[PDB]
Ligand binder design. Sequence first.
Ligand SMILES: [Zn+2]
Lengths: 541, 180, 178, 348, 203
Amino acid sequence: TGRELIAEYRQLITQFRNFIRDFSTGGFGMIYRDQLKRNYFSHEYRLEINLNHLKNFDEDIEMKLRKFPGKVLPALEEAAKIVADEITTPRPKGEEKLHDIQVTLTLDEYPTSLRQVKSAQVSQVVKISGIIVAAAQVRSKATKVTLQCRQCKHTIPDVSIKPGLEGFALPRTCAACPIDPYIMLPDKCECVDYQTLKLQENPEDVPHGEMPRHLQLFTERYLTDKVVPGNRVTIVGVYSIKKGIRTPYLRVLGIHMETFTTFTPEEERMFKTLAQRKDAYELIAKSIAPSIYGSADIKKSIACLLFGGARKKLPDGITRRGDINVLLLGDPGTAKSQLLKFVEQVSPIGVYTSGAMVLADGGVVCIDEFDKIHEAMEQQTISIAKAGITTTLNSRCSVLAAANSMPTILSRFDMIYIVKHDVLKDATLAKHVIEVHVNASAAKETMFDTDGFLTIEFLKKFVTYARLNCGPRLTPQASEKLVNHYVKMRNPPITVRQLEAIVRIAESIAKMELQQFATDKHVEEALRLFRVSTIEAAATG
Amino acid sequence: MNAERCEFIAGNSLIEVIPSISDDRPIHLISGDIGPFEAGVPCRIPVWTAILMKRKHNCKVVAPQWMDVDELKKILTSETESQGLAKLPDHFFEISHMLVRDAREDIFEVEAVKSLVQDIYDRRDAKLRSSAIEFLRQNQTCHAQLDNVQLIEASSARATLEACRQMGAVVRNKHESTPL
Amino acid sequence: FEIQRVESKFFDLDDIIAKSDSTSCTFEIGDLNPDFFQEMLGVSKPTQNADGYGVDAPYWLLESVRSSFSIQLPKAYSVNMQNVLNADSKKLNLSGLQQHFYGNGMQLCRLMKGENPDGALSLARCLVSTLTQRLGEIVSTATHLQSKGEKFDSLETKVFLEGKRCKEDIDTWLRQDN
Amino acid sequence: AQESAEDLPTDLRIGSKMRIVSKVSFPWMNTRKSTGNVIVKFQTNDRFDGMQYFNKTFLNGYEDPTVPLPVSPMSILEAASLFYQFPVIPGLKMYPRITAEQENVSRVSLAPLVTSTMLEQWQECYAELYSSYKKGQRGSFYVATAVCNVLFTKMPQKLVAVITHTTSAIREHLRSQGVDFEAPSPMKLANQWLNEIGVSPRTDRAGFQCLVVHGSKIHALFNALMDSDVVHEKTGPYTKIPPTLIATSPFLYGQLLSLTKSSNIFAKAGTKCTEYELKLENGPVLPHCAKMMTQFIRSTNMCSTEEKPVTMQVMDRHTSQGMSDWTETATNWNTVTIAENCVKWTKN
Amino acid sequence: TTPEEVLRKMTATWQNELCAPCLLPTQMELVEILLDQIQGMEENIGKQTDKMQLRISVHRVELQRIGFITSDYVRCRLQKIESNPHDAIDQHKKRKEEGKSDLLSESEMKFAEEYALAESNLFQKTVLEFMPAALKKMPVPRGDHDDVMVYAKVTSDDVGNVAIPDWQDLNGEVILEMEPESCHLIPFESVHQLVEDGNIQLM
Ligand SMILES: [Zn+2]
């Protein structure tokens, strides 16, 4: 009865060829024909088809494709191959080989709940939604294999293997020789990529007081390496049972996703306009955390932390650091954690936390509750030698620390503040802050913001621009002041660490203006900031 | 030179229409007389004038003889068999696109006509691509023959001219570098 | 009001930038005033060996040196690289090597003609072979919508831009007829 | 600057192509003045008479400068274009043989019987030519190998051989073969110092060149060319095909051959300057060719308006650079102007 | 000669002028005739009392087409003159010395001279007055159309033969035959004279 199946198969190929050629949106717009031609010349051997367009063209083959996908879908792939040959011939010399094309599907329906796939839906096309929770490494699967007999060396070529997580059984005895005599040649088989994923149902759809359920997914060729854990997806695929009890899995036919370092001349002109302004440094310091009152010198210090100094390597190989580090002390209140969260949002790379020290090469780490590493701060490296291990972890970053209160580690911080009788001024602040929170309750009921402060999306891009492009130095006249200041303070706790910290702060201030050189102006502002911050620790405690 | 100017030149061709209005005198265009019009009696006018009347419901357009399905199949057969480009009617693709755009009510067997025109365009495009790729491997000559190319096909393929101009400089540099 | 006829590419910014590049060269000791290295190149003292003063100089200056001098080929045009590029250049990133590849090669041939005719002819043959291996790929690559031309030379960029312009025009004309 | 003489100076470098340009039409062209291609058409006994004049010029084994001329100047044109060559294959180009100068000529598969019998004939043919050159009375001959060109000649006797376009590797290989030629330390102290302290001791290019051999030392070069696999290509389009030999006087297994000739008319811009072009291609352009072609022009009186000169050009002579340096009787030239009163060239 | 012939000649002139890389001999005579025809038809329509009828719309659309052709031709020639004005004057004087047809009309020549003076003033005020006395001459680039290719179609019956450079040996040249329906990819300087004579249409 094989000729009847051959007649059915060739009829299906004829109808799918007619669908790919004749479907149109009016005029000369044959969308699938044009898409197939563009994909083939782009060297992407794939096509994507909408089943509602197919249902409007012919209802019967669409219904058959849904109910018998393992029988009907290879005919559609074969029809796509034939139409691609017709479209592209005569191909140029060297490109005579005809490639093999993968067909994918889309479908406009409500997805089925992952808990409510009926047992009648085995071996049928279904649509499911969820979250990707895990993703394995890509592996190879054999499509066609060559067999040879162990004793008499007779061969069976081009034995084809069915798709999915299915095995296949070898011939038990020789066709032309003991039990199970055939072997598989490693050199004369064809292979394609595949990948396994795991899908979790959406937490919105879990019934109250229960854990979510899971399903395993199988993907092939162009559908591999398309997703990462955490992604939200909708999937069209065949519901299958893995080879009287079996576990189920889904063979994927279509995925739908439910979700810097480059600039325009407009962006460069915007950055340069802000750099050309005289009040740019004060404007950036004002733009840091506008919801939190006051703290002007602290906001200036955080701007210096974000921009940093230059980084140097002399001919003998000893490097000089560019990072800057800041510490905050005093009462546990006054929105310290909100300042740290703002720096975490604004910084090009960064982390907030209460190891963690490693994870920010070129970035910023905010540490709360610091009263809970000396090598990490100075050497930008930590080391270990315990039983059976010795390694070193190296990473470059700047650190902002908040404490609630060792005298040893105070040497490692460039700037220190003590936050500390507010009640009369705090009455006006209470009026403003409670008016803000009642306005937030009422709410519950692109360089500039509306209030003149800089936007976060512009500020983050501008910091990322400046760090990769400015790189300043000091003028000799700027260098001449620091020598006299150092000698006077030391011969009226003065150290070379403090001198290099002042030099780094002066370079950081000159970076924001996009200067070639730092001058006496930047040195004097750096000295003012250093005195105002550090002498609080000399006066207190 | 671009596709809009190609369509502009293609508008000067003549085509036959059947008016429903009537008029007594001729119309003395600078491009020559076209009238008079009698209702139900066909006559020949320019393509731009035909489309202008068809938009105002003043006539019915009669398609060219080469838009018959048998004639299109003959053209496709010759284009498939010949190694070079086969010969076509003047402004073939432009007149096809203009009439499908503005007068598809009057074309007969519209989908079959449209599909055959798309087939002819596809394989002529492949022939031109292969010829240009095989030319750009050359170093021995700066000449090729491209008989029966259409104006819009020539307009779409101007990268080859720039590539040949760039190749000639390096060839001249090698000739001047040859010692004596 | 008097007129001076000049080169056809006198005002070309790309040609000025191409002339502004520099190559490694060597000059004979004592045959030139050592004021030259401070006067033209801004170098206080030449680096010196048994063969001569060793420096880098720009092409605009090197054309004016009617005295004796010698040229060393840069890294991108060294003979091992010539063998590599002549073997297969169909997918290599020439812009990573040099943004003015063919232009600097033609300048090097014109300079090296008096010192080393065989090396000059060998480099010219290499340039012709390298461009022949890549022009068809450029003209084909221009037809994709997602192409952005990252790897191409300044000379190849002209062909790429013209091809993409033609593709945009014909696609815009076709999509009226829906 | 310009250099000049009464007659054409000799250049001994063999070239690949000759082109001659004139403002006066050639005899077979005179019907036409429109732009187009013209056949070089010969008439009656002209080719046979030119062949007679050629063999009579070279009958003694060296040139006789006193033979009477033919009557048709077309026979002078024919006699200028002839030479003898071995080996023989129809449909394969046999010059130039340096691998850098081949365009990609097509593959030709051949039987081992054909290649073996060809090599067996080649050894006898080459030995016969060399015997008649050294101890007989032959003038000169050329050999074009895959790596170099060689010339054997006599000084106006003393014998001289010249080799051209060699590498340092080929020079050292000939040294290992035992040829001699008149071609154009502190590290030991450092190693000694290291060994004296007890530190462990484990702590020429010159481009392309020519060579000249005098006298009795030529016989070593003869045996080297007989032997080496360096000159007998074992891999490529010229697999197992022996080197080419060329002469201007007959030798055993030598085949008589002729250059390809063609001609064109160009017209431009409504000017007086129609231009008439003659080409000779597809073989070596030996030094006698230019000398006879000068006589073809001067016999047919194309110089009569000497205010409109005629120019001649010979190409690819740099592959054989050096063959005219060993004497004051020769010259390097590439482009030449002919008049009746003089012949001129550049200082070069 | 009819206006129906003048318009047909003008269209072929417009196509050749767009395709050619340099300046063809001027054809402002046909432009002046067609502009006068536009004005005559405009005044004739202005004498009509009834305008909401088919004839007036057909006439006005034809005037639209003719105005487009003439305007685009003049714009292309002005954009060519602006690239190098001194060289255009030089080529016109050389054609006059050779006794050939005009490259520029009188108004085009006047425009070229006035634009050249206006362009000279900016360079003299910005740079050249500050130079040393040897460096005060005005630079003028040479022509640049040496290696340009065209697609060309043959229309005349008896065109004959053409010569092109030989890329195998650039000392010499190769001869081609042009059969009277063919299309070629060819250098422009080989077909320049035939494009002037109207035996070749550029594409
Ligand atoms: Zn068996």
